Design a protein around this nucleic acid. Structure first.
Ligand SMILES: [K+]
Ligand SMILES: [K+]
Ligand SMILES: [K+]
Ligand SMILES: [K+]
Ligand SMILES: [K+]
Ligand SMILES: [K+]
Ligand SMILES: [Mg+2]
Ligand SMILES: [Mg+2]
Ligand SMILES: [Mg+2]
Ligand SMILES: [Mg+2]
Ligand SMILES: [Mg+2]
Ligand SMILES: [Mg+2]
Ligand SMILES: [Mg+2]
Ligand SMILES: [Mg+2]
Ligand SMILES: [Mg+2]
Ligand SMILES: [Mg+2]
Ligand SMILES: [Mg+2]
Ligand SMILES: [Mg+2]
Ligand SMILES: [Mg+2]
Ligand SMILES: [Mg+2]
Ligand SMILES: [Mg+2]
Ligand SMILES: [Mg+2]
Ligand SMILES: [Mg+2]
Ligand SMILES: [Mg+2]
Ligand SMILES: [Mg+2]
Ligand SMILES: [Mg+2]
Ligand SMILES: [Mg+2]
Ligand SMILES: [Mg+2]
Ligand SMILES: [Mg+2]
Ligand SMILES: [Mg+2]
Ligand SMILES: [Mg+2]
Ligand SMILES: [Mg+2]
Ligand SMILES: [Mg+2]
Ligand SMILES: [Mg+2]
Ligand SMILES: [Mg+2]
Ligand SMILES: [Mg+2]
Ligand SMILES: [Mg+2]
Ligand SMILES: [Mg+2]
Ligand SMILES: [Mg+2]
Ligand SMILES: [Mg+2]
Ligand SMILES: [Mg+2]
Ligand SMILES: [Mg+2]
Ligand SMILES: [Mg+2]
Ligand SMILES: [Mg+2]
Ligand SMILES: [Mg+2]
Ligand SMILES: [Mg+2]
Ligand SMILES: [Mg+2]
Ligand SMILES: [Mg+2]
Ligand SMILES: [Mg+2]
Ligand SMILES: [Mg+2]
Ligand SMILES: [Mg+2]
Ligand SMILES: [Zn+2]
Lengths: 104, 124, 208, 150, 83, 138
RNA sequence: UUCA
RNA sequence: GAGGAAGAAGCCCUUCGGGGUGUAAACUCCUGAACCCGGGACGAAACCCCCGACGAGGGGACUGACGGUACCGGGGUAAUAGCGCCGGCCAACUCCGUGCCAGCAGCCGCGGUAAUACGGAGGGCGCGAGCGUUACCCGGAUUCACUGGGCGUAAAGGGCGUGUAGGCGGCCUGGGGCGUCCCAUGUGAAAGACCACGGCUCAACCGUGGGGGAGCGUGGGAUACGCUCAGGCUAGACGG
RNA sequence: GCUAGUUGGUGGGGUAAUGGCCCACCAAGGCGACGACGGGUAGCCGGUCUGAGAGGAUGGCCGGCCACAGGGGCACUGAG
């Protein structure tokens, strides 16, 4: 079975390519508490169709580029930028923790 | 620590530091003597404990106890170190094995012979 | 080497008589007679209450010194028993009583366990028909334990096997003085053995 | 009838002008090996009087141990002060696996199979007191039964 | 070029082989494709040679190539009998 | 505000009985009610029933103890000697039916929530299923 | 002054 | 190996009456590792050859390093014992030497003239073709605590807020079924581990067979709790 | 905090074959506190030792995979 994942598009900045963020849930090995983990996958969109806030299914695909081993299968819901937001805010934090800072 | 905290930072493994850097952990290690002084014990004890600085193969120079009634170590004696602390001499963490190399086994020894490297005298 | 040395001395260190001889440790001489105190230059003076440990050690020492076995074989046996199901205690004894060298004694072909051990070694014994010289050999239920055809006519066999004519034997054994054979019916139940040992302690010795 | 086991005896001393004045303490157990045990801590000017005093007290302090065939009915963990004691049932052919103190008590309570563990402060006095409570605290189906019946 | 050969098992002087299917290139005691029989040349036991013929016949039918000795033992188990 | 309403219930019951109270209210939630069914059935609590303390619905929980006792401290032996949460927010706990615990060699119980409903340890075991392990009681 |  | 004294000599101890080493030895009788001689392996039946059909079958020959080894039968001598401990933990005590020396020492601690702790001796305790030592791993150590710990004074509450990420989330109903639970099924090599039989006289070693299971994949199923999406509520919160 | 083969696109080249694997040209992109980048250390596993277990420690023998063949680079031949 070619793996099929489901995530949110969080970047339409590539020609025929989109970043999909996939949320993985599971109990922590030793401590039990069900923890949340996640990864971004660069999926293949040939007709630059899917766009941010989009929730789509990603399917294991034949290589397409160094980093692209997934084509965008179909689309589930859409436009829900609340997620894309969550992702962005977080990334924005990074500018604070370092040598400089960033108010909250 | 909340379970969340534990997930977040988890526990810290306790590494134990060795009390015998005769490098390689190695059972024993050898070197040559650099000095063969004697020292005084501490706290309540008194005596003239015999010791020896040793230029080790592990590339170290440590002070080592010379167990036994009497010894025969001089400026350039080659001996095998084995390590064993000596409570009465701060700084003395290794023992010199008697019966190996230039360290002669204590003679006239009749009991704990295998230690002090002494061959069995024949019952005549 | 199987011990080899003063024997009617282990007898008195355990404060109990040990038949580590047989014919003599029976008639007014096992020393346990007018000499039941421990061996040594101090053996007479009164002892101090033994430590739970001490008490536990001396007991393993009895049992082990009874069967005349090295601490190594002893320990291996115990462990073998530990593993096996069922009261991993009486099973230990079950095993012990299964050693050929022992059965040969229990069957009377030998006077003592030590003397029984030499018979096996010097191939004077025959399990199920074939010769065996391994005292540790384990006897299973049904194994015929005869006397070597050629050894059957030996001076000590007659003597020993003679006194047996009449004498009753273990409810788990059975012999045939005539043909000089004998058979291991089954592993003895704790009830079957009359031993100066509280196995429970030997177990509590290894638990430690 | 009743068997006595001496868990420990210590010397202890109270200072006083002129010097130290000593006085011995003794913990002893009493049990019929029939499911009854009593703990006693006696103290006196001399060891013997102390042991005597102890024995006397153990009888005044008995407990009914619900033996379910050489073993305990259910697992129990009792905490006495800074001392914790764990009692777990064991099938036959195991024996009593415990530190000298818990054992002495368990053995005279006529327990032949049981698993245990000393946690926290290993203070004899307090571990002895812990197992007593653990025992004094064991229930049985019958008990739970009458207790839960409306 | 897969084979049906003997793999050594047992101990020093106690040789017990495992008639196996394995690529022509593995160690003789390496990872085989399937065990299909077993052989004890000393024949200490009454049963010193077993050979799942249904299976040997399979591999033979697909290109398996038996050692000459592997063939011998396999014959005894009438792998080739066609009566 | 309450973080673990179930933990709360359990605890109100623990606290109440320690001082030996008659009943003891506890905010109503079906889940909590399903928990009580078991406590009642197993014979840990006299029983329980709805009530409307000031409009908002509660659940009187009628506690149950033993009989007055001898010597000093005549206080009755508790029927609920122990009641403890297991799964908790931020450390949820589950179990395969092959992993459902035997509380006090059976003398106790372990209420656990399965996809077949809230069942006791043996209940859920009987009809072979597992789920979130709610708590243990004895 | 050390050591009991 | 079985006998063998109210008990040798020596050695140690002694209140000198005696005690210990101890049935231990001597000695008597029995067996007979070593070693001598005789026989002597399985592991090796194929490829090949003839018949038949260069098939199936059936006959036939060759080939053993190990090794004259294992094993068998006969003969046959009483034929190595060490090492570590004995203050407590921790099984095992007494004399003499030494006098804070010479030395021991895992930890606690012994030695300053009566040392069960040093060194010797006698005796004793453990093991035994081994016994001790050092080095290293896990254990005890719930002494990094998930199971299974703590933070007033023992080590430990951040000097105080605001608040980002994250963690956590009251009451009712409905959809989904991500976590969670269930059935089925594929996978989970051999060896090892467990069990049962077996082969070497036993065992170690070995063979055969048996039972495993988590994890992950696939197909179904459940929906209490958690998650999510919808919609309500007022008891939390905020506002008037 | 790291990154111009970096991330992607188009067309090629190359190989048994996908691929920034390598080119030409066009896009600005890609990754990071669910720890990028950097430093240290280490072949991975079946398993082994230990532990009541959870866990800890290991990876010699033997079996599987990988990597290297004085150190660095390279291609030829060939089913490889
Ligand atoms: K940045
Ligand atoms: K001494
Ligand atoms: K350790
Ligand atoms: K502070
Ligand atoms: K391209
Ligand atoms: K591992
Ligand atoms: Mg491309
Ligand atoms: Mg932890
Ligand atoms: Mg060293
Ligand atoms: Mg000094
Ligand atoms: Mg001193
Ligand atoms: Mg040391
Ligand atoms: Mg009762
Ligand atoms: Mg406490
Ligand atoms: Mg503590
Ligand atoms: Mg409670
Ligand atoms: Mg001093
Ligand atoms: Mg003799
Ligand atoms: Mg043949
Ligand atoms: Mg042959
Ligand atoms: Mg022809
Ligand atoms: Mg040839
Ligand atoms: Mg012969
Ligand atoms: Mg002692
Ligand atoms: Mg010493
Ligand atoms: Mg040996
Ligand atoms: Mg730990
Ligand atoms: Mg904890
Ligand atoms: Mg603490
Ligand atoms: Mg302070
Ligand atoms: Mg403080
Ligand atoms: Mg403060
Ligand atoms: Mg500050
Ligand atoms: Mg928040
Ligand atoms: Mg909620
Ligand atoms: Mg689901
Ligand atoms: Mg499976
Ligand atoms: Mg396997
Ligand atoms: Mg056999
Ligand atoms: Mg097998
Ligand atoms: Mg291309
Ligand atoms: Mg590139
Ligand atoms: Mg991540
Ligand atoms: Mg390396
Ligand atoms: Mg543990
Ligand atoms: Mg542990
Ligand atoms: Mg390997
Ligand atoms: Mg290279
Ligand atoms: Mg080289
Ligand atoms: Mg080169
Ligand atoms: Mg080519
Ligand atoms: Zn005797």
């Amino acid at each position: 079975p070619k793996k099929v994942l489901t995530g949110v598009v969080v970047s339409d900045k590539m020609q025929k390519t989109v970043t999909v963020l996939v949320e993985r849930q599971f109990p922590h090995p030793l401590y039990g508490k069900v923890i949340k983990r996640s990864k971004k996958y660069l999926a293949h969109d040939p007709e630059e169709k899917y766009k941010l806030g989009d929730v789509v299914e990603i399917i294991e695909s034949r290589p397409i580029s160094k980093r692209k081993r997934f084509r965008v299968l179909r689309l589930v819901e859409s436009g829900r930028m609340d997620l894309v937001e969550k992702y962005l805010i977080r990334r924005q934090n990074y500018q604070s923790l370092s040598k400089r800072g960033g108010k909250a | 620590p909340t379970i969340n905290q534990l997930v977040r930072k988890g526990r810290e493994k306790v590494r134990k530091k060795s009390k015998v850097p005769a490098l390689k952990g190695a059972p024993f290690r050898r070197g040559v003597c650099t000095v063969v002084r004697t020292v005084t014990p501490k706290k309540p004890n008194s005596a003239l404990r015999k010791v020896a600085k040793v230029r080790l193969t592990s590339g170290y120079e440590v002070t080592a106890y010379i167990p036994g009634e009497g010894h025969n170590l001089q400026e350039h004696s080659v001996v095998l170190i084995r390590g064993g602390r000596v409570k009465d001499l701060p700084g003395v963490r290794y023992h010199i094995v008697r019966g190996v190399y230039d360290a002669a086994g204590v003679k006239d020894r009749k009991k704990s012979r295998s230690k002090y490297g002494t061959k069995k005298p024949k019952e005549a | 080497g199987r011990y080899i040395g003063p024997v009617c001395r282990l007898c008195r260190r355990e404060g109990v008589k040990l038949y580590l001889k047989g014919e003599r440790c029976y008639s007014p001489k096992c020393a346990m007679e007018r000499r039941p105190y421990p061996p040594g230059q101090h053996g007479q003076k009164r002892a101090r209450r033994p430590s739970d440990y001490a008490v536990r050690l001396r007991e393993k020492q009895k049992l082990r010194r009874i069967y005349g076995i090295s601490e190594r074989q002893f320990r291996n046996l115990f462990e073998e028993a530990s593993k096996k199901k069922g009261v991993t205690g009486s099973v230990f004894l079950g095993l012990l009583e299964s050693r050929l060298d022992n059965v040969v004694y229990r069957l009377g072909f030998a006077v003592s366990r030590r003397q029984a051990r030499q018979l096996v070694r010097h191939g004077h014994i025959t399990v199920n028909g074939r010769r065996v010289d391994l005292p540790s050999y384990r006897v299973r239920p049904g194994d015929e334990i005869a006397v070597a055809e050629k050894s059957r006519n030996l001076e000590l066999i007659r003597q020993n096997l003679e006194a047996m004519k009449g004498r009753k034997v273990g409810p788990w054994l059975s012999l045939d003085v005539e043909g000089m054979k004998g058979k291991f019916l089954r592993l003895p139940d704790r009830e079957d053995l009359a031993l100066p040992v509280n196995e429970q302690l030997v177990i509590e010795f290894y638990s430690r | 009838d009743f068997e006595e086991k001496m868990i420990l005896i210590r010397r202890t001393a109270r200072m006083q002008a002129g010097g130290r004045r000593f006085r011995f303490g003794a913990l002893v157990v009493v049990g019929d090996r029939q499911g009854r045990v009593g703990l006693g801590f006696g103290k006196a000017p001399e060891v013997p009087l102390a042991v005597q005093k102890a024995g006397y007290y153990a009888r005044r302090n008995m407990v009914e141990v619900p033996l379910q065939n050489g073993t305990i009915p259910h697992e129990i963990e009792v905490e006495f002060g800074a001392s914790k004691i764990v009692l777990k049932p064991a099938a036959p052919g195991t024996g009593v696996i415990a530190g000298a103190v818990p054992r002495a008590i368990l053995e005279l309570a006529g327990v032949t199979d049981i698993l245990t563990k000393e946690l926290g402060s290993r203070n004899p006095i307090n571990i002895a007191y812990a197992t007593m409570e653990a025992l004094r605290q064991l229930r049985t189906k019958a008990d739970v039964e009458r207790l839960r019946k409306g | 070029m897969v084979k049906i050969r003997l793999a050594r098992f047992g101990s020093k002087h106690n040789p017990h082989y495992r008639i196996v299917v394995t690529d022509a290139r593995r160690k003789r005691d390496g990872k085989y494709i399937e065990k299909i029989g077993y052989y004890d040349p000393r024949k200490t036991t009454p049963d010193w040679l077993k050979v799942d013929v249904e299976r040997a016949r399979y591999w033979l039918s697909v290109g398996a190539q038996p050692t000459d000795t592997a063939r011998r033992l396999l014959r005894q188990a009438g792998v080739f009998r066609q009566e | 505000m309450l973080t673990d309403p179930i933990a709360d219930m359990l605890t109100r019951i623990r606290n109440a009985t320690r001082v030996y109270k008659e009943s003891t209210d506890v905010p109503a939630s079906r889940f909590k009610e399903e928990i009580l069914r078991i406590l009642a059935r197993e014979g840990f609590i006299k029983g329980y029933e709805r009530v409307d303390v000031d409009g908002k619905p509660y659940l009187r929980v009628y506690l149950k103890y033993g009989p007055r006792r001898q010597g000093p401290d005549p206080r009755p032996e508790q029927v609920i000697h122990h009641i403890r949460r297991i799964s908790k927010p931020g450390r949820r706990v589950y179990v395969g039916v092959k992993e459902i615990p035997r509380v006090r060699r059976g003398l106790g119980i372990a209420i656990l929530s399965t996809s077949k409903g809230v069942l006791t340890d043996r209940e859920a075991r009987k009809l072979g299923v597992g789920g979130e392990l709610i708590c243990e009681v004895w």
